[PDB]
Amino acid sequence: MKEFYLTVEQIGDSIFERYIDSNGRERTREVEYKPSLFAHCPESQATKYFDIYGKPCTRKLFANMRDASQWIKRMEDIGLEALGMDDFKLAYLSDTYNYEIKYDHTKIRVANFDIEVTSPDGFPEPSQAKHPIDAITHYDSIDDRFYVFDLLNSPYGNVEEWSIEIAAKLQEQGGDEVPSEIIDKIIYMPFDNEKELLMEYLNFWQQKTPVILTGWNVESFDIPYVYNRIKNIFGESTAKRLSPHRKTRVKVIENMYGSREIITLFGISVLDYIDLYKKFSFTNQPSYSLDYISEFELNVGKLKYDGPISKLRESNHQRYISYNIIDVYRVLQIDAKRQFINLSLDMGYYAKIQIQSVFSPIKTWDAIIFNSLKEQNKVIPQGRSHPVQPYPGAFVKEPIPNRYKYVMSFDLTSLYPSIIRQVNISPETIAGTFKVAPLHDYINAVAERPSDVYSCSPNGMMYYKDRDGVVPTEITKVFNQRKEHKGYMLAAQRNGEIIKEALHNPNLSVDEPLDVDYRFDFSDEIKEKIKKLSAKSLNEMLFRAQRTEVAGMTAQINRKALINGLAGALGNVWFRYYDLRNATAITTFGQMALQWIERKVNEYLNEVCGTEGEAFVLYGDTDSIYVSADKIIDKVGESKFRDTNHWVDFLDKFARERMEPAIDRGFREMCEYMNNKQHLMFMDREAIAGPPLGSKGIGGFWTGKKRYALNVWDMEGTRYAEPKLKIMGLETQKSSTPKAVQKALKECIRRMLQEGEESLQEYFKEFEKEFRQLNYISIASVSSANNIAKYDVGGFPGPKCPFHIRGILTYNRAIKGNIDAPQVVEGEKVYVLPLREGNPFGDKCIAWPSGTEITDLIKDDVLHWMDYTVLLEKTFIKPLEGFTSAAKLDYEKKASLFDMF
């Protein structure tokens, strides 16, 4: 077995390392690590160490780590560059693990825990920790067991033991429906007092010390609460037993306004799952309560109880404990699905960083690039301080608001990383500058050729062509991984569509799902077998196919975020390789590439239609073009096509055989023009959109930049069983618009694109007729709530007070004096509802914490005073009017014109 680190810390002049040894065993060592740093020396000195620019460097070996830090300081006082890895943990891992790390996840202790704390006087502040901890469920990945620590006696109630048999049975039997598949995995431990529970929990922690510590909100609540509670009862030294090296810190953590407190446990890698979810899931939720996310991800029903959570333990301790266990399992289930822990470890070990540093792309890329350079004996530069400066980004084309019947989109593969590689954009590859012409001149190939020797970007930057920079070299490796996993993702997606087709025809039999790998396109034998399968087996296969696709999406999209992170990090002042010359070289080249290809695609299509000046490209954002295919369809049919799938094949054949070769010729020319290192602008067909053949649908529409809808039949080679709506930027896509409204707007769009104007007018009429029956939560807007206490002034809306903030102040006033009423937490999401004039709340809106029912006292009143009229015109009618106006449609008839008869 090859060895791998678990955790690494610097504590004074010692590196503290937990690792897995050659025998598969967890181990700990304290290494008195002697770091090296570098200084420029004259050429006279024969050395093997060179900076990234090829300047000679002398290596400086320090007695300890504090000596290395003092030298960096004194080099600053002198005014000279101190080169090398100043994060000595990273240098240590580089020296100790001088190879590609193969890790074994089965040897890494991943702990998933949740605590319960009964609080009769509001939220229990983790930094006070004044209330007893009365439940801890702690799952261990190695044991595969849920360890339940249950307080039977508290100042808030003496309770009976939790019954495992009641927990197992249905809600309909008096039970808690704790999943069968985990019942045998529960190790249950009741305690007579909190001191006993906490002492036992600390002994347990010692024996099964987390490497990865996760859960929901554990970093902001669970961890600091357990730490401070133990600290209040036993002292600081006992609290510090949560760290394997007995060292903890705070932390702080900004931003403005104001600041939080977390506990840094040295030798643990805390990956709060809420944080993993926000970084990697690529959703924006109305609520981040576990229950909301569990419903969203797993389609599991909200685990319900009577009364408030502060009375739950004394009124129903059985359910209290059972829900603590289910809370932990929920997070494991979301991970089984999303695989964010797996992803974190992959990226973390790849980069050779503390695993928790996957949260910082700057940290991740600094470690990768350092390790790539160290391998060649090259020395990294000192990080400098830079003033934050704005710089330009992508080009977005203004669309003409309209409907568009037949649409084909084309999209550049990993654009920004592909520009890095093509141009050879890197800190050490800068060759100089050239006199820049207006961008428009490069777009039209009218400017003089920038260089005959170097590789250029239209921002004026020239780059070496003899060898690849460290940025191109390393961005390529992660790009190639991204491409691998995207393949598995798209194949899984395609395999899912074959199952959906076969679901049109079971096959009334008792059989089993096929043992297949969904990452690969189903063979003809698997296809045959699928066509003989029951609905039960086919649905189970769909679930599994869709799970593979999710797994592929996680792996692919976050490797993409990482590489896009690097292009972005070039424009972040805290990045070691921060250069605005390079950041702009990427974005300017991208602007040219899009507008260059727009010109070429128009020219091509104008040529192959016999026209001049006609604009076939109707829109583009950053790296995408949207081509109007009406004239291509018109040249053939629609006479003339058997079905929808027939013109979708014709357009797929035309895009792949005629257009892409022309796009590639267009891009090969631009590469020569810029004299780039290698041609890497690959623009594949993305979507084929249009109305169902023979229908009165409009196919798609644009309202403006970054706001559009299309009816897609084929996406990147996935031919759908049913057409899919691709809606971008419109209100159906915003977390802020109500659930019921998003749904309603979506069906309006669907009818517009697939069925026509009259189908739209009948749905709108029906929705307007029934919308007052909708549940208040389903029709409440959502906003994030920043700067509440600023507005307020005091406590009414102050000058320029935002609408949602006003609603919160209304809420604050209606719940004034209540300890147990839910407080609106600053920086979180709220539900917002408009209020009718003359209401007892004395303002036009009320807001409350999202993902929650509003307090029983006031609920009846807001429900009574809810302004449905304002609600409808604001969230539904205004947006819908914007759609139909853009699409040249009416949601209301209109005319009409006969009229009676």
Next chain:
DNA sequence: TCAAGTAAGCAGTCCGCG
């Protein structure tokens, strides 16, 4: 809302616009 980047939309406040 600690944690790579810019572009650009819409809601609402405030206030002009004879």
Next chain:
DNA sequence: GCGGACTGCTTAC
């Protein structure tokens, strides 16, 4: 009432 300066929030890349 609408739009523009401005803040707040949110999304497309």
